[PDB]
Design a protein around this nucleic acid. Sequence first.
RNA 1: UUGGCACCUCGAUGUCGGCUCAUCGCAUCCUGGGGCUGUAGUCGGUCCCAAGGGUUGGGCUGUUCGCCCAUUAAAGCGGUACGCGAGCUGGGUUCAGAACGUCGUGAGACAGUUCGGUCCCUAUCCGUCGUGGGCGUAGGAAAUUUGAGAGGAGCUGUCCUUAGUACGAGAGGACCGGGAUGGACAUACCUCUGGUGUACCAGUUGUCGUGCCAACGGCAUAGCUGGGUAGCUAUGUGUGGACGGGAUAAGUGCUGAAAGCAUCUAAGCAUGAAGCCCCCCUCAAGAUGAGAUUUCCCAACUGGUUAUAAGAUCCCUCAAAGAUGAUGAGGUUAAUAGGUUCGAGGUGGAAGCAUGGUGACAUGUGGAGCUGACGAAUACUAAUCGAUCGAAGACUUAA
Lengths: 120, 215, 50, 121, 113
Amino acid sequence: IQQETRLKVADNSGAREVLTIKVLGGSGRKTANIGDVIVCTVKNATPGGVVKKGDVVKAVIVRTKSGVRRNDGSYIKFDENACVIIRDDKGPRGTRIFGPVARELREGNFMKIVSLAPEV
Amino acid sequence: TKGILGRKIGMTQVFGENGELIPVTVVEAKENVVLQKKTVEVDGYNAIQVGFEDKKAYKKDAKSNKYANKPAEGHAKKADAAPKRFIREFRNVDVDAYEVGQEVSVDTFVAGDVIDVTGVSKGKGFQGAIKRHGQSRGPMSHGSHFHRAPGSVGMASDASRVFKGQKMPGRMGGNTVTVQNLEVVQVDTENKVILVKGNVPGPKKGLVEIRTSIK
Amino acid sequence: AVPKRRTSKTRKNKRRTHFKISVPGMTECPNCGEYKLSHRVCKNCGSYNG
Amino acid sequence: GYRKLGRTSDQRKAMLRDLATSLIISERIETTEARAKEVRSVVEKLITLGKKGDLASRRNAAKTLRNVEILNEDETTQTALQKLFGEIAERYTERQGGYTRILKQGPRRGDGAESVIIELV
Amino acid sequence: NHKLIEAVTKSQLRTDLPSFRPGDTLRVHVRIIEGTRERIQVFEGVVIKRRGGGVSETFTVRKISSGVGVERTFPLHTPKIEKIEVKRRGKVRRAKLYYLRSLRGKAARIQEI
RNA sequence: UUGGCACCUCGAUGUCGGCUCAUCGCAUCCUGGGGCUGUAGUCGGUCCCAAGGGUUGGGCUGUUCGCCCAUUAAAGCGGUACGCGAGCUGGGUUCAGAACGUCGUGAGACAGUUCGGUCCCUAUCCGUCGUGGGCGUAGGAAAUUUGAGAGGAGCUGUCCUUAGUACGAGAGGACCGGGAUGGACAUACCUCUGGUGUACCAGUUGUCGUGCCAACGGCAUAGCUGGGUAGCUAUGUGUGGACGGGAUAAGUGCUGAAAGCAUCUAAGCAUGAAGCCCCCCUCAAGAUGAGAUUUCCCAACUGGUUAUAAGAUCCCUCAAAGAUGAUGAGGUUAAUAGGUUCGAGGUGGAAGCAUGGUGACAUGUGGAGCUGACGAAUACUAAUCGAUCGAAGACUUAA
């Protein structure tokens, strides 16, 4: 969200917490929102998962404590930020997803996430 | 169509047809009248004066501008209309309005006329460089004594003077500002009100003039 | 800062053009007869009658 | 509030409670024009409460009014509340608001600050 | 409250939806215009706040889905909230239930009226 | 740049690197237009014209430089006292302390290295940014304006389509067009999401008070904590850089000879850039070249004077305005502010009483009671009475 924000990876990909490095899209952009691809490095992990700590990967912002406006005066505000570690295609790297995800992620091509998400 | 004059009531929100919430500004435009019709007999530029709000008739006490003085009353009788406040002048209209004063009804604006608004912006009294020009304020902790002053105000001793258009503290707001490419949400007759997508300049109770966008 | 050069007594009197003070804005009392200060109570004799 | 009186919130509120009590004790006082423009709006609402009369209307009066006793009742000792609910209220029970009036006197010496005589109508 | 603002914007006000109180448990039947069709994805949970007045009256529902609490803000008079059904009337002793945004378990319970 | 000189300054012109604020050049990093390729296409190379706008965030290091991580259309090179300390810092270098290595017999010194170490000034003139007064603009005014000029803006990616088309064995993959949608940045506003909200509501602790209980008040950052109205605000909500005409640069030419030919040039005729001039937005008639248009006032006495007219103020109530003045809204024939009666929104169920508990308490009476700035009505209070300023229209010449 901010290039120092510690996100909770809600994806079963070995990584647990990640630190934001750069918010892709724009020369000098400084804020990402739900459905925005961020470059981040893994700070914590689970023993025996493909994403080992100390590596730079890509993720998408799935939850946020500030939320989205949804174009018709309807606000959604999750309780804690979270990201899914993702590949160079708009598709997840893991196999499970934990917790809610936002519907404005479907406008992008993250249909595999919402397919895997437990609810939207 | 006929750019009219109005009074800024407030802001509200409406719901579209796909239910999209829409911020809207409410303007009242009652008692528009055309007071005079320029031609090339007068400076060579077609135009029409319209007066928006009416004053009282002539009086002898007459010490608060609510009572039309004699010159304005003459001018407003020469079109056969009550003395108006807020006389303004519209170009970019064909002279098909009458030199007489017919009511300039809001009904000329028809449900999706891209219109732009002009008004005097809200007044901020004597703001500083940060507020007035959005400059970056210096640090505040590490032994710093520079917080909100302007930066340096020129080069040292080559020019030896301060150029014009320097950004220094002074009086803010108040200027005439114009917002372009706004939309007409609805036109409510029986109140002479118009609803505009967004937010026009100036405070509430402030004069605003509407026009059809030149772009 | 310090004045680089003393102020000529012409520039002093030019700057002091607007330093004049204005009249008090007074009227004649319709009861006292003497002068009062408009919208104030007559110091000399009695009421305000407003 | 409308206008800060060159004081702080507790200090200004004490100022206004004192002025209001003194006004309804003396029924006319000479003060400064801004203090009067504020004591005006305070004592207006106090006498509205007095005109109401109910007990809650008495305990609300009893928080924005001081505790002085009026010795000069000719051996009687009214509190300010007893004064305000008997005499002031029964007096002004007809008119619908506007219970005082301010009269400018002129510039006080030592400030040049205008002096006013705020009194009960 | 300006009579002209109201006179304009008082057809937008829905008329049949019930009146709850901030602390009641609601079920909102929202609509979903994405895809090529609508559904009615009920959002349950406690009423954290009602706010404002007029056409601009919003409320907030809060539900803890799976270890994660989601809050949704809805304007009252949106035509998308098809209906609102009140399960159980809670007792809150205040207007804004913001302390519930930091409670997590059996501490975020509300009584019944 | 490293220098060379020693011309100004030793009765004093403050160093480097950052910050705030910029500004200018072009020897152009990006975007724009072209030529030539050893240019099949996507991408290049190298030249030419072009300065409109743009040209990132971090790690390390006092550092500039520099190396690296990650994006970017691009992460340009330079001047401005190596721009800017009466705008900021004091981290390095060059004040006193102390120590290491080392040179010195020694006091002590560095090729060095390390820990610590007072950064004063109320702006007179010019300059700059905002704002009033005077007079002028051949009568005295109110209002609306034109525009000579001057300032502002000017950026850009990505996805879909044409079209897997052209081009290529393949792999790959288009010009020129349309469309949608972002980044950054400008500007307007407060309906929404939020922040603030010290004369709003509620809870709660210690202590002193109103004689006691109950209910309140004072003090303790506003005692603290939970909310929040108007206003002010961004991180919130809208809008912007549209579409185009004219003259052009490098280039592309047509016609065309001097020079039977050819030849873009000599005469002539076009085309041709994010650039110039308009178009967009803003100030603008002190534009002394002081412009215009409409309406108002225009007598009485002696070359002329006078006051009064239209109108404007003084004084007063104010706020959408404000440092003050000015700007607007009003001054009783009156809704300008206060009060009053209604609401709006905010809080969250007042006091008293009845009931249940033995008691802390709970319930009903009752979405109650309170409520600063928001909307409306109401002359209850105060804008009283008065006073000042303000014209009688020069001179020629032609009609």
